[PDB]
Design a protein around this ligand. Structure first.
Ligand SMILES: [Mg+2]
Ligand SMILES: [Mg+2]
Ligand SMILES: [Mg+2]
Lengths: 150, 151, 147, 146, 150, 156, 151, 145, 53
């Protein structure tokens, strides 16, 4: 039968009022997953521009406030080795020297690690800027960046 | 309660991330899209859903949308001696409606406003080729604010 | 003790309200169909739009539940029965909701409710369901929302 | 049951009492033209039309009448509108008047018909006299079609 | 009288009454398992018709309301890669763009995605229709679709 | 106990597709069992019992042609046609079992000629084994030439 | 009241019967059937079900019976110097058992008894041709008492 | 108890037995009746292999119920009377019942008090039946012994 | 019924089983069979909870 309260099955009028405040191009909190190629014994600078793309619905943005960064190895490690990945946060005001590392305990398993950016270091970064250096015995690294597009 | 409320520190801190989660590069997005449409005095006007997908709204990677409710305002002044008015007639691919949700301005200098909610049992996707509602008014332009889910 | 005035009273009206000259209408529409022995009859949604029901002004409707009764006596020695197979534009069903009489002189009846996820609009060209019966006519009472 | 996502059987019983032409409580919006200094008699027939889904009715029990000035007033003047209820058993002499305190704003007033006077009216009957300095008055009539 | 306040070991009479409502062809809520072949870099469209088959006892149905969809990689991934799988729901009233993706964190383990269809999109579907686009680096994906046959 | 409160409702619902963080591949079964009330009719001669074949339960008309076995739980019967002139309808059921047929004659008679007669019987749990198309459910005697059955059973 | 000292009356009364009820001229009747069986030394005797069906038990009208529990007693004195004993090996059409539920008398002049219950999942009907169990005993006769459900 | 295999019974002394016990029943059987003529129902009708009671020679009747088994004469509503009978003395009641729908059975029954519940053999009569329908259906609650 | 079970790790066994309802727990002899077994693996290992009698 379905209820009649009221009635919940047909269009109903909305007693709107004054025109509100609008914004066609609002912000957007997201977790952007993407991968990068990494060489052995060399750090790779993760460019912020990768966060802007139609593949994420974010190419309408030009700046992004990074909150946290997480990385997983995306390919198998060398023979006899265990996957490992490292993150060195970068900042326009001053690059860091931390090497947040994670090593797999099962060769067949990924190695993972992340780092949170404190509030006092949460600013906008443009495509030209770099998020962090990535090091890994695996040739590709899977990244998942929590950030705020604006 | 209270205290730290998480971490609240001044430098980067490690995250003991684990197994690669479930991700989605192209998620959904619930939005309130504002956009205008020109109208003539005496003729209805079908609002194309294709107006909701546009780079002006960041809703450009989408091809389908589920509309929840529609609200309309007269964007321009009415003719001389008249009070603004605006009508909305919901439209559905399964069967157009005959409602004419109408609102009128009680002050000539003020907008007319009206809107309608779409019940859950009629909230299916619409693409660019589909329509939303017929709009009537004595004002030559109508401002729409449409609550919908992009997917 | 519950009566108000005996003369007209003023209404301190305000700003012109939101109005709708053509509202919706939740109804229970009764109508009959003619059914042949052993042949299913597609009930046309267009039957619901008619001045006989004050619904000639609608072109769409949301059906909620369908109830059916046999309108005429069944064949000799037989008991009445009636069957409803829901029909949907998105995918016809194969259910055969059947009710039977226990007294030859009595009507057979059965109905089916439509879940909220399948309650979209239908126009005259569409069909509600299939009807089968040993009786030659079936009386239906369709609960529906005109809009 | 609502939680169901498919059709479910109904164990219907006796053929119920039915009515293909039921009644309907409505708020009917429409406008009427008015000349300066002349009262206009509102016809009940303006309530029976396929613009209101009511062309299938012939009688209606009016409950309350509300009016708003639909067009601007004369220069220098504030809008006003009056209503004199009319009844077949004897017209009234009240002039329920409302005025706008801002020239750009509509003037509004309405009256309630008491229970004892809520009888049917037909297309030839008249609801009330409308007076106004604006040339068109919008009316909303809460009534019961039957 | 059963067996004196027990479960009884004998047939017992039922005082049946009027002939009830009946339905020889009732609805059926099911969780259908089946596999689909997926190649590299291309999306496969899952045909709703795969749900109608005598291998699921459902060849008597011509329409079905789908509720949820779960995918699992059915074969091992390419050398050095971690399995993954994506799911893009499809609807007649408007295909979606979500690429619900799930990856494996162990090369020898499956990757699992799943997505639920809201109620307002739970309409029937026939064999000619489709359910979703499947992507995966594995040559085959196992699917378990929770649906309602009617 | 105290199952009185609570509500759940999946914490309300939404309007768009949502991800499911599925896990391991579950256990599955493409050809599961099915509990059913199967309605069908059988023709009866006057004063001659008719053995109801179990094979009637397996038919595409009931969506069960894919089953070759079934466990019967309860049998209910109704006279499907009018009785003889001057007679009140009646129907008898005699349960049949492979391990030993019964001699019961569960009988129900109409108290109005225009009305159906009805009766049914319940199979105890210690007799609810499987049956195939060739086996029989019960005998059916009646004064009406057709009997309507509704057999509550579990298709496996 | 009414008839003055009714309810527990010494007179006939009227029953306001209604619709004709569901009848069954051949119900089931659960029983405890006592009967004897002759036994030879060192030889097992298969007890036939068709010993439950006899006008001596009013059961000549049944053809099938569901056995629930079997009980046995030595019906004649045992050999010289011996204590009575009796053994039961349950038999089933779905598969014969190998148990030997045995009893013995602690006084030579006293009967030896024993029994076994049939679990629910094994309580199907049995016809005359079938067997219930095997009986062994040093006494030339055993008395039985079977709890069974005729139908 | 709750198991799936035979279990032993620690039986004791041989118990009291009875191979031919009593039996409480609700025997149904039909009898022809002529118009304006009462029919004496024979207790013998209660002893038959159709009821499994062919082994009883006596029975204690407790209550008798009757339903018209065939349709009534044209224009007439069905009815049926019961007159209890006893060896110690026949009664003169006529517990009557009349159908309120020509298509419906007429029904009436009577209950026997404990002081009149002695045994009756085949040659004994339970009651006289009268009706306008040529056949009457009887359900007798009785204790076979 | 075809009660199936698959392994989420290639190196790991796939497992599944079925319960027999009380009403179907009769005796079975050597000639009888218990169930059919299908598998892509060449050898399957069983564990049958049963009551010998
Ligand atoms: Mg790795
Ligand atoms: Mg005005
Ligand atoms: Mg009669």
């Amino acid at each position: 039968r379905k209820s009649t309260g009221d009635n919940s099955n047909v269009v109903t009028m909305i007693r709107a009022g004054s025109y509100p405040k609008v914004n066609p191009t609002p912000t957007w909190v997201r977790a952007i997953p993407f991968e990068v190629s990494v060489q052995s014994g060399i750090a790779f600078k993760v460019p912020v521009g990768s966060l802007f793309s139609a593949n994420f619905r974010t190419d309408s943005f030009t700046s992004v406030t990074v909150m946290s960064v997480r990385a997983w190895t995306q390919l198998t490690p060398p023979v006899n080795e265990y996957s490992f990945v490292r993150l060195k946060p970068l900042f326009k005001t001053g690059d860091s020297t931390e090497e947040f590392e994670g090593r797999a305990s099962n060769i067949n398993t990924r190695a993972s690690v992340g780092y949170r950016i404190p509030t006092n270091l949460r600013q906008n970064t443009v495509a030209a800027d770099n998020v962090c250096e990535v090091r890994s015995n695996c040739r590709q690294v899977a990244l998942v960046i929590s950030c705020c597009f604006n």
